[PDB]
Amino acid sequence: SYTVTVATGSQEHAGTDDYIYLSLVGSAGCSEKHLLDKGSFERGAVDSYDVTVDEELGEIQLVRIEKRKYGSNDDWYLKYITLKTPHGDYIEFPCYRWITGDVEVVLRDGRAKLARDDQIHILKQHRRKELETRQKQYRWMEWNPGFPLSIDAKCHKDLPRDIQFDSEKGVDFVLNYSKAMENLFINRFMHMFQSSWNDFADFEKIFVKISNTISERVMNHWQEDLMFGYQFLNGANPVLIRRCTELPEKLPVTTEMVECSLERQLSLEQEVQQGNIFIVDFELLDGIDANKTDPCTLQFLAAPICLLYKNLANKIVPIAIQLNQIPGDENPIFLPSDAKYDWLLAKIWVRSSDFHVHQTITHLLRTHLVSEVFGIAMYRQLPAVHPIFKLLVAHVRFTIAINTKAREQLICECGLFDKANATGGGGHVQMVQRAMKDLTYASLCFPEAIKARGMESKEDIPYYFYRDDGLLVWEAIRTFTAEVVDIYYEGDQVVEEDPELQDFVNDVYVYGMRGRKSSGFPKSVKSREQLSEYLTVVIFTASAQHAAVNFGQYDWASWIPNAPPTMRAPPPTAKGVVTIEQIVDTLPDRGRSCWHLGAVWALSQFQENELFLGMYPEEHFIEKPVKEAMARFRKNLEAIVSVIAERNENLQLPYYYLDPDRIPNSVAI
Ligand SMILES: [Fe+2]
Incomplete structure (x- = not known):
């Protein structure tokens, strides 16, 4: 008899009441379809069954799952399935997908395999059909002229369920921004687009209620040349x-x-x-x-x-x-x-x-849109059993979803972004187009990016904390990806000959980056070292870089005079004319200030169960060597946490953004 264990996810809508059929694909054969429990798989539950088979199957290759309607369609999130075979073998089949009932789901055991590892028809067939399905499911699309290509879907609900947020309105710009304004007691200003603040004290009365440690400091020191300059190194857009x-x-x-x-x-x-x-x-x-x-x-x-x-x-x-x-x-x-x-x-x-460049270029284009390119290419070209899929899937979690939400609600024509931002209404689209022309692979390689700007010397420029901490996290990731690469690739030739890896890299180049010659992106990857670097670019951009530029938005921009989302008069063309009263009227009205505060607060929040760098609860990898690599990665990050902790004890204003305990795995907000 086989003991078959099925684990349901703990998300809100993970449970299902529909029928679940399961069959086992072996070498010598297949098992009959077995209906499971005729009952319910509730969220967070683990269900195990005793299953006797009508025939000796040999080594199990695949597990098939089929959901059939009972009542209405009820989504089911399947974490994994495990088997305890008659021969006393323990086999694990990672899934971590939404099963909608539309189609059969077929799973490999968790051991990571390159195409060259699969020689029998059963496995090759499954691998090729999986990619055929992936490429029908996840398609490229040009959302606006000149943009990096993105997912072929016009709204969040159009996405395949597998890459949607766990909830429909869980992470939602319209809702999250409005709840933010309520929590900040600025709801009453949401429509006051024609009303200036009476003076700085007028805004201050509103602001002191909702300030945190850093923004309060900004309020008290924003007029100082020292604090103005400090931000270029250690602010939100350094x-x-x-x-x-x-x-x-x-x-x-x-x-x-x-x-x-x-x-x-x-x-x-x-x-x-x-x-x-x-x-x-x-x-x-x-x-x-x-x-x-x-x-x-x-x-x-x-x-x-x-x-x-x-x-x-x-x-x-x-x-x-x-x-x-x-x-x-x-x-x-x-x-x-x-x-x-x-x-x-x-x-x-x-x-x-x-602030303009930060929002649209540093943040949107260079972390969000870039990360979505890697994610889509991953889904299109890398099967679930591939080691690179197992490695990267955790670092693009919710990325396509958050981006689709943004294109649906925030940065579309007449979106929320148009309310407070001077670049809104098409200007931000122009910026992305122009920045794309100069976006290079090298500029995503953190150490090279720092040197290209002549900011690398710790001796001459001792107070560049973004640089210091960034370099540490970059190396930690480089070490980790290198160990993973060396585990599954015996040499450079094996890397060069991996057809799925090459198609992944090729999709990023041709579609993601529009096949632009000057992008500098590799057309192919032909060494373990080059592969490691590539994977570090993906992971670092998705985690550290995004964290560094995203989670300091409320800290530095909440005191609006220090980061005006718009200006209501042209720049002064002469000296000795400007008055403080004129400045107040040039700064954002109460209305645009309200939406600004709402946005930067909402975007700076962590989820209650946020997954931070190195946290991999979804065990796509099940093998010991790679698990040990992950363990060392975690220990290296902890050491960096201590380094940064000790550095920050001696600072007027601690730089926390690249503390690995505060860096999410992926772009998810
Ligand atoms: Fe973000």
């Missing part, structure tokens, strides 16, 4: 600043203009040569359409150039700001020596520009 190797001709700033800022008795030009000058250049925003979806509110964008300076205390501070790209009499170079509110407003404009 990926733009680079070391200037020569002053741009489009920024005609002189030593005499910034002499008061310089502390080494050197000319500006010589400070550049010493590597003490840094720059943030928002040329990408130049020519982007401003939000016009509200005809009663004019909104405005800039494209600033910010020149920064590493002072004697090794802090990077702003010394000059030109708010538009082309120099001229109506495009002043503002300085910390200007009138109080001239310099402040200039900084605010830079902060606003930083």
